[PDB]
Amino acid sequence: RVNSITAQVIPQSQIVMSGDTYKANIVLSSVDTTQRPDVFVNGKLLSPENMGLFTATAGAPGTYPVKGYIEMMGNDGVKIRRDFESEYFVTEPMASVAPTMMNVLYAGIDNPINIAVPGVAQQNVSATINNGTLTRRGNLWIARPTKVGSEAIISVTAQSGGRTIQMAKTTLRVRALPDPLPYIEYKDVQGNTKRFKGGRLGKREILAAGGIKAALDDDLLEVNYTVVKFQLVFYDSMGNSIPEVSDGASFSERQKRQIQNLGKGKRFYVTEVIARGPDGIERKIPAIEVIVN
Amino acid sequence: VNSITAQVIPQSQIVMSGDTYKANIVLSSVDTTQRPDVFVNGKLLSPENMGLFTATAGAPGTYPVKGYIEMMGNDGVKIRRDFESEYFVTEPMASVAPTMMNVLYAGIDNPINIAVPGVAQQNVSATINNGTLTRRGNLWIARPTKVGSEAIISVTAQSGGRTIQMAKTTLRVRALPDPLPYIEYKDVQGNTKRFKGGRLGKREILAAGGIKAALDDDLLEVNYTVVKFQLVFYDSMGNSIPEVSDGASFSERQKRQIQNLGKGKRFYVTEVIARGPDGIERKIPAIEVIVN
Ligand SMILES: [Zn+2]
Ligand SMILES: [Zn+2]
Ligand SMILES: [Zn+2]
Ligand SMILES: [Zn+2]
């Protein structure tokens, strides 16, 4: 029945790292291009439109099996069926795509770093850092840099031979975690949570918050900042400034009363706002203008 | 009449994440009478190799895989099928990527280092799905356009015969950060310092001109200008007096109002609108100014 004999070079990978080995299966395919056989692969029957080609988008790295059967109608009316069991491997990319405004590490938090060596298993690799610690966590690494304003050099080595081979020297910048901005967490007329600029806000909506909260604008950077202490500035009949201290990240009873008896259009300020990041460093963050409405 | 066999013929048995595994599944009619001969790169494969040809990767470059498969065509005539493929050896590398740090900023040039160590820059050609990704010397420049959406950088090597996907990188497009306001002043020695609030001298307020805005970042070497601001003063009757400014400089109204303020008296800088290389105008925080 065959009308087409073809030689094929089927490699494991078309790109190999120096020192690894190129492996290719060389096979003959004697087929009948007239036929359209039923291909059941990985619990699915291929649609005739696929023309025998099975495709799967490579997602997470690992060992993926290709298992099923092929069946076609023989010339005699006897179905001819053949089972198969093959496999493919998904790897990490062998191209580094690094935005330079992103090569940074933050002191005080876990910095997940993906150290990927193609052609070598995750165990054969060893990675070290010159600033802080670089430990393993599952399929990832964790950098905890200690010296802010200095460089962090990640040194990756694989060995896989007689002499220990250097794979990559990566220089990264060490920064303190950013300073947060203060805000007042409030629920709108619908009930949805919004974060005050300041500018203008209702007193019913002010007292609902119960204090000052501190966080970053982003989303860069998913970090917790707590308000240590803050002050509220008020104004008497003599035009003098009255700075009232707060009970931590919550309004004091002296302040709470002042806000109630204040009145619409009247302005108050939140000054000397000290916030604390995971690194434990207390930091002076900016002020907010609060207008009653 | 000899045996029929199922065959899974992939493009590659190893696929990098982001690429797609492609395999042709066929019924092949194998002759069990005689074993064929596989001659590849000047060597005849021994039956023990089971069709597997292996070569140790040495110096980086383009290596060809060439040869033929010979067999008896049942008609006293030997049949030959030639094959010609190739592999690439690369300088041994490792990718060190901090996973949290995946942001591109809209409104500026985002230098991206796309490194495929073994190959040369001509060989590599990267594309982006959000904005533009152009070449600049030994680097690439992403200019993302849609804030809050994803930016997927696709790096390819193309070449003969098949087009190989090198990397698919997921990035987040975010707006440039907002700067913080400051008043630039020279101390008693002449050294420049930046006041962000708290207490400050009278003559030292008068110099410099008005308010300045900046972000402190040595990677994002961007600059912002103060568009407009207000100074909110307080009289003897406890009333708020909001005086507008002449751009990034104090107005003659504000200047004289600061002059008649006694020691300890408080005034504010709110609102404060600043724009960057974006170039987007943005409401930045306020400053409490106390006279010394
Ligand atoms: Zn290998
Ligand atoms: Zn296996
Ligand atoms: Zn039959
Ligand atoms: Zn913003």
Numbering used by the authors:
A (entry chain B): 224 to 516
B (entry chain A): 225 to 516
How did the manuscript describe this experimental structure?
Finally, we suggest that due to the structural similarity between PorM and GldM, both classical T9SS and Gld T9SS membrane core complexes might assemble and function in similar ways.
Full-length PorMp resisted all attempted crystallization assays. Domains D2 and D3 could be traced fairly easily, but domain D4 was only partially constructed due to poor electron density map. The D4 domain was easily traced in the electron density map because it was stabilized by nb130 binding, and it was introduced into the PorMp224 structure, generating a complete model. The resulting PorMp224 structure exhibits three domains that resemble GldMp domains D2–D4. The most striking difference observed between GldMp and PorMp is their overall topology, which results from the PorMp kink between D2 and D3. Of note, the PorMp D2–D3 bending movement can occur in the left or the right direction, leading to two non-superimposable structures.
